[PDB]
Design a protein around this ligand. Sequence first.
Ligand SMILES: [Mg+2]
Length: 182
Amino acid sequence: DGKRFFQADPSSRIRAITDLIHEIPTAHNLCHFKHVTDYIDGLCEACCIKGLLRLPVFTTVGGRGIGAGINNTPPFYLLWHANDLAGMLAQNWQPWDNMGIPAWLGSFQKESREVGLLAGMTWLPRKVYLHDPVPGQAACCSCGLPSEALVYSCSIEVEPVPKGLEWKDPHGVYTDQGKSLQ
DNA sequence: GCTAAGCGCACCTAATTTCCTGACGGCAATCCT
Ligand SMILES: [Mg+2]
């Protein structure tokens, strides 16, 4: 009962859990997919979390009506790598003077532009509520690890990314004209 | 019943020209709104 992680204002539109993830096929303009079917099998909690982290980074266009993420169409992502998590964090540490207001706080105040890095790296273009049914699953058949009762669907809306916001992702790659490099 | 040796060439020259095309025609869907 309170604030929730990567969740936002009240919702009405309901979409299946298959579209939060991208690697598994979703409800396209078809009926058959790569042997998946919506509202039958769902993802685990870890898969749901790793799909929620895909939202600020790898959200594409939804047919030119649904807007993209904060860093446009998802560009090339480049970073510095090491054999350890300590070297993982240390080699990509370069911070900026203004941090920003990340989305794991509540409803952030828009105020002026030039968010920084911490507000821009965690921008939420979608929402999640999910309606919990009475009990749930018995054996998992979508993730692969046989788990307890899992999710079935969710609820996704969009937020229009405004104009301006002169901002550069630290790991993104941007062309000569400032557009995203694909 | 049916033979056997020896002998078998090389030199000359072998060519010059000029011409050799142009224009036209080259496709679209449908594989995320
Ligand atoms: Mg899984």
